Design an enzyme around this catalytic site. Sequence first.
Site, PDB file in Angstrom:
ATOM      1  N   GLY A 220       0.931  -1.106   0.072  1.00 37.24           N
ATOM      2  CA  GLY A 220      -0.115  -0.009  -0.175  1.00 37.24           C
ATOM      3  C   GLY A 220       0.891   1.367  -0.141  1.00 37.24           C
TER       4      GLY A 220
ATOM      5  N   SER B  61       1.635   1.285   3.552  1.00 42.58           N
ATOM      6  CA  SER B  61       1.957  -0.021   4.374  1.00 42.58           C
ATOM      7  C   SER B  61       2.484  -1.154   3.392  1.00 42.58           C
ATOM      8  CB  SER B  61       0.454  -0.459   4.830  1.00 42.58           C
ATOM      9  OG  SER B  61      -0.074   0.154   5.989  1.00 42.58           O
TER      10      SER B  61
ATOM     11  N   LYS C  41       0.962  -6.370   8.783  1.00 38.38           N
ATOM     12  CA  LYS C  41       0.810  -5.090   8.010  1.00 38.38           C
ATOM     13  C   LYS C  41       1.937  -4.136   8.733  1.00 38.38           C
ATOM     14  CE  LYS C  41      -2.491  -1.486   7.096  1.00 38.38           C
ATOM     15  NZ  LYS C  41      -3.795  -1.270   7.196  1.00 38.38           N
TER      16      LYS C  41
ATOM     17  N   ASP D  52     -12.814   3.989   2.372  1.00 37.47           N
ATOM     18  CA  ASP D  52     -11.711   3.680   1.305  1.00 37.47           C
ATOM     19  C   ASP D  52     -12.101   2.461   0.584  1.00 37.47           C
ATOM     20  OD1 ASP D  52      -9.567   4.169  -0.194  1.00 37.47           O
ATOM     21  OD2 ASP D  52      -8.145   3.266   1.351  1.00 37.47           O
TER      22      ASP D  52
END
Length: 327
Positions: free
Chosen positions: A46, A49, A66, A154
């Site tokens: 991400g 992340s 994560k 999101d």
Amino acid sequence: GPVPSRARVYTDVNTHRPSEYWDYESHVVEWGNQDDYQLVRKLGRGKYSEVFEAINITNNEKVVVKILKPVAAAKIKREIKILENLRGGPNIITLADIVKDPVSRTPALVFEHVNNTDFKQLYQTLTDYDIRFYMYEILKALDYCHSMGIMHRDVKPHNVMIDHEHRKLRLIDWGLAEFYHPGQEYNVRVASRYFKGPELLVDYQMYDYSLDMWSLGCMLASMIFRKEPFFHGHDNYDQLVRIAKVLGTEDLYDYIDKYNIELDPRFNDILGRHSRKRWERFVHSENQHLVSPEALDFLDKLLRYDHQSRLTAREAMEHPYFYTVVK
Ligand SMILES: CCc1ccccc1-c1ccc(CNCCc2nc3ccccc3[nH]2)cc1OC
């Protein structure tokens, strides 16, 4: 100034909860042992992340790790509180631990393993039935979080993990999620450009759960029409223009008039005048196997400028589009 708005469902759920539920800044993070996990493989990435596959050496089970970059790390308390509040809900990723690397002083969230089918960003990979089935699964997660007073903010293909072998799905990355409080004004710099609702694009801060429904409609349109993304804005201003080229400027103006929204002067020269288009215009030989009158009706009821008019997640689950899905 702007006319106030409130969610038409689950309006006061947070108001009825003790402050520990939603007052995330008061939450005390109990840190786990980072040495309980060994990294095995990289799953994905991400913007804020790094995601890896790891083994919890205390029970030899697969886990997902994560690792959070500073901007994601600053809102950790919010993400943790939301994940803990939703833990065990339908199709919600399960937070298993919260750890900190003493070497880089960076935090990480550990989740229960999620069998993840790697579609390799190829979206012409689902049949009409599978689109309906997986959309229904996403709706279960959204109705759950909205019912718990949380808006995801999101929703997009990247935040949905699918186990295509076991036909299971998880809604992930709750880093941008927020608690809904009636009358609260929220930051509009949320979601991903292509999935931003008109309320964010016109700077209307008093939004709610319905923001998620717009994003879900963007996903559906991209899938049934085989057009990635569906609303391909070059930037946030052009994003509204792309929307206005499909939904029309008349309804846009009615929306801004309803809520007495002051439009930013950049739009003057860019919005022009556009007719509302019929959904049938996006139907071609390559996508006709994904389109049906029920799909177009459902999409029409999600992709509305007026956030108060869109279907709620539970109303969407009642739609005829899902009558074929085995329940
Ligand atoms: C509901 C099916 C669907 C309907 C309409 C439009 C799109 C889809 C769809 C949604 C999701 C996916 C798979 N997304 C995986 C994203 C992902 N993998 C990760 C690995 C590591 C870290 C983060 C990750 N994040 C595929 C889709 O259609 C084929």
